[model samples]
Target chain A: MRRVLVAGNWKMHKTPSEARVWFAELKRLLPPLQSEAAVLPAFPILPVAKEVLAETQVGYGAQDVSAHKEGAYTGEVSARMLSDLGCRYAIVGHSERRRYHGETDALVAEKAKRLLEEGITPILCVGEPLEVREKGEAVPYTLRQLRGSLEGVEPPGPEALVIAYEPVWAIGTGKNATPEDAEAMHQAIRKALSERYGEAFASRVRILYGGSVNPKNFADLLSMPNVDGGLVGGASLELESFLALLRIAG
Target chain B: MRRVLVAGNWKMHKTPSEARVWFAELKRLLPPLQSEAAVLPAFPILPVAKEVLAETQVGYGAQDVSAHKEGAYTGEVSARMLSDLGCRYAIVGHSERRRYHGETDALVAEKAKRLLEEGITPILCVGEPLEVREKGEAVPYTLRQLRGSLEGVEPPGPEALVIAYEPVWAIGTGKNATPEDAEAMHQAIRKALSERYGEAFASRVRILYGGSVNPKNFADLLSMPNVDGGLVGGASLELESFLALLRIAG
Candidate 1:
């Protein structure tokens, strides 16, 4: 079985002073866990990570990637750039980008391919918008998004990509899907992958449920057959809440 | 008068290896001068700046700002974050954010205000979209954006804000505004400011021209009475071209 992984995406929040204090606290809390875990601060907190978490088992990542290979795309951060900054992983196709930046599946695929090429693991995000869920097209639409996002790329290895299923409606809105709902969608995603890439690939791949994922709901989500872990948002910002989720996952 | 300042916005270009090599050549080719000069690379290459620009007078900045003060804006780079990284300035509102992120004038203002409050000078960008300019209402539209962006901002001092006027239509497109077109719009913008905040305030502000600025056209634009310097794009990617522009501006 794949080891469960937990990471905190401190999305557009926290000051350097605030990061320094919280990171020091997280350093004291997370390293003792035997399970695989990581915390991603926004780009500004990267130095803070170097000062606080680099020496520990916890790893760092960026929340976005640039589409172009290198030159002339203004205000973009690339995958290779993230690796050079000491990041082991980066998140791609987060709901915010899809909603705000109009990042289509094709764009997300290109970004993931770039990250993989740079030997950086992309935590590939896939989710359904509210309308799709309401229309009872959640499973198909999400799987379709995942397929399109990972299209054309041959998996370099067993763990070439990390897929996180974050329901858009639930992220940062204080709403969370039932554990059963999570399990059902995760199972559908796994089945779809197994059909395409074989059961071996599907089994080796860890599917994380994201959005409003917290300690209170983590145990149930983790215990589900196909729901491996979580791509936590607000709850992961604090050391105590994140540690509790880590404890639950372990 | 403050020496005219020319800064290259390298945008999402150059990896560390590329930046290091470019800086090496630039340091050798740059003319010794007293005028202010700078380059804003994507965040990943900042460490390259601290190492390479240690002895040079050329300054460096980041391309964007974090919405939060620091902790969780995962993909964002904050003002204190950049300042801690040794950045002397940051670009707050570029056409890309307006086009891509739907960043309203109020949001841009907040970003600039925060940068000033933290004592990091903001290169606040103000420009009219294509439709606004086509209607020959560029002055009113741009001034509206400027007023909103500078709303709660008490100028950090005389040099607190460097107003960069980039015609959004000309950016990234090989096309450029004719020198007369540039001067007319710049004078109009300056006149608007003088009317709004008085001549003393307007004269104290350094206004720049950007959008497809090249070495070929740098001399004429820099010579304009109202055009203090440039916020360059494409031609600024190469070290040799950039150093030449710095020499021209000086």
Candidate 2:
């Protein structure tokens, strides 16, 4: 059976001190992982998280990785460095990076390839904005993004690659897509993967629903057929909320 | 007199293991600072550098910092995290970032402001490309970049801010501008600073030269009146070369 993978994209939150406190709380509250789980913290906190969570089953990753392997790309983090710090995963092409940092689909694919090269899984994020949803083209638009992001990327088996569907409108806006809506998109993403790879490959890959995922709504979201888990945002910040989601996920 | 600031921008190089080795070598090879010196390693190695360099006078910094204070900007490092990690400096808006990452002058300025806010000194980099140099508009063009990068930035006194002049044409190309040419641009940068923040502030602010800077030419480069020090690139990677540059600066 494909295990549920609940990964927290802490986006750009948490100071190191705050992170240390949260990790301590998590260590006390979080149980042994029944499902695969990870936290993608900001770059500086990776080492801190690694040190704090080393003995825990809870995996840690970076929020992003540099497309260039290394050399002269000032301000960019490389996959090698992430892996060296014991990062289990790397979130590539988050909506914020695409919108604010001008990350293109090709670049995201490159980043994923780099992560895979370093034996770190790549959580490839794909989604559409409100405009596309309003136009009733959310599925097509999002599928296009998926195709573009994975274009020329050799799938590093199903388990090594993850897809997060984070709709632009719902993110950090105190709004959320209905569980049904999220499941529909997740179904579409799985179908596309099945077509691109194969039925077996598609069944192995975990497709996550992101954007305003919280404890109150997580059970409904995770119960859907294609919904493997969640790529949580704001809800991941607090220990109580995160444990709530983790308990439900387990 | 403004103390020389020799900073090594090891842009996107060194894994954590590689960084540890380099730091160990640097500790053995580099002498106590007569002039201030810092190494800007990629994000993952900052803590390693800090640990290795703690007992010595050598300082370490991050190659880049996120402009956002916190929340939702993925894959970006924050200045607060850097300061918390014991980073004494942050390299903001290097030419590589501007060219590859689409870092605009305003964005660079914002990054510098953010760094200053976190009590981390920003090594603000500004330079002109080859075409601008060919047109003999190097001074005005670079000054324009300087003005735009520091647009509304209130100086946090002289020591809190640094300027590194790294021409795009010269970096990694084995083609460096003459000492005279670099001195001219340094004077122009100082003149602009004097105009914006007064002569006293200008005299106290350090201006560094960067671009294929090596031991062979470092003494000549640092000997110029306005050239306070260097932001070494390729030369900084090697123990011998870096020590040579540091010795010359000392």
Candidate 3:
């Protein structure tokens, strides 16, 4: 009974005022998913999210979070701060952070622990690059990222974590992995989860197919047995495109 | 009739709520400056500056400005945005930007030009690394940064452009240039200004000596004939210490 969740990562885009226009357009065009849905805008726009998305079906989340509670961490956002801003979820261990900031699995796991402890769901992002896929090791790499990113928590609880599998090569490159490619990785992810937290829990867990899912290809991806939803990027920025993807799941 | 200027560069620290608290304390404890003083908090906090520093002698400025005018440049604070937030000044060409972001004097000058065109004063920062200073070529290297950082800008008028002379060798290193050393660089800066613009233009311009400026050395640095004021860092975070530095100049 898992519902389609289309979480939007408006990475490093939109100011407060501009977000208002987008939100107004989104509200007019995209009604709440007939099923569950989420829209995680950038942090600066979260203040406006409070007003526009208030009591609506679309939930808001932050793109990143600081490891510490508070004090002297410059150019960083924290889970507590996100909580104060009404964020229900926070993305942890995105591939960009690993590539650019050298964030390791242990660090990502700590961030996840903080978010969960604060009663916020940690959207754990696990992915592999082109090289790993070419090496025929995408499943192993992604599973390792997932295992390390979710190390501390006792699993089997749906509310504690939401896993997204986005292949690194597909992001921002305009090349989407085929539906079969996504389904294979998602099935492998469920298998890995079953190995860690028993088959019952794994079967029920929602595993999202994330890399470059869009209006054009979302139907094929979301219709797969193991594919529960999508974690979208570029397509989510526009109201018309995002609405198309949302309805595609229905 | 030279009035001193003190500026605090709060680089990438404080969220909106925490900033409100800090600004509240600052409003209560800040002293009257015979010189004009500015506090450059991070851009996220800029929107609250007008309300927080309201009815006060202190002024607000932005740490950086994006070269682009508006739209589509992600995670950037624009000059117009700063102005809309009631910022009276903006600091451009800081050594960190040059060192970290591959920012050149040309880029900085372009930002400065944009600021000036929008009626916001640009605090053009110029400094030399330890190697250049140790080679006894500090003045030339610094003045070159100065000239390049203000490439297309016109001569000094009333509030034309403010210059800050910081020694890269000393910033954040727990070391500071002596008053004599600062005086020499300040004098060199004045000479360059007079050569480019005129003695009257140079006389009208305010030159700030920056790099680890604290209350302990505030008097010594501000006492220099050509050293018109201070652009402070770490010590400026505290209400009492900033007030102490302000009083030292008074």
TM-score of each: 0.86, 0.98, 0.73
lDDT for model 3: 0.77
Q: Residue B139's C-alpha lDDT in candidate 1?
A: 81
Query: What is the lDDT, from 0 to 100, of the residue A243 in candidate 1?
Result: 85
Alpha-carbon deviation at B145 in model 2, angstroms:
0.5
C-alpha-based local distance difference test score of model 1: 0.80
Candidate 2 residue lDDT tens string, A111-191: 989998989999999999999999999999999999999987776689788999999999998788899999999999999
Q: Model 2: residues >4 Å from true position, as ranges? A: none
Q: Candidate 3 at B192: error in angstroms? A: 6.3
Clashing pairs in 3: none
Chain A TM-score compared with the true chain A, each model in order: 0.94, 0.97, 0.94
For candidate 2, the TM-score is 0.98
* TM-score leader: 2
- The TM-score between candidate 1 and the true structure equals 0.86
By DockQ, highest first, what's the ranking?
Answer: 2, 1, 3
RMSD of 2: 1.2
Per-candidate Cα lDDT values, in order, are: 0.80, 0.88, 0.77
Candidate 1 lDDT, tens digit per residue, B1-250? Answer: 7468888898877676688888777777777887788888887677667668878888888787755575434466777767766777788889887876678888888888778777777888888778988898988888888888877777646577788999898898877777887888788877877776778888877888998898888899887888888899988887778878887877
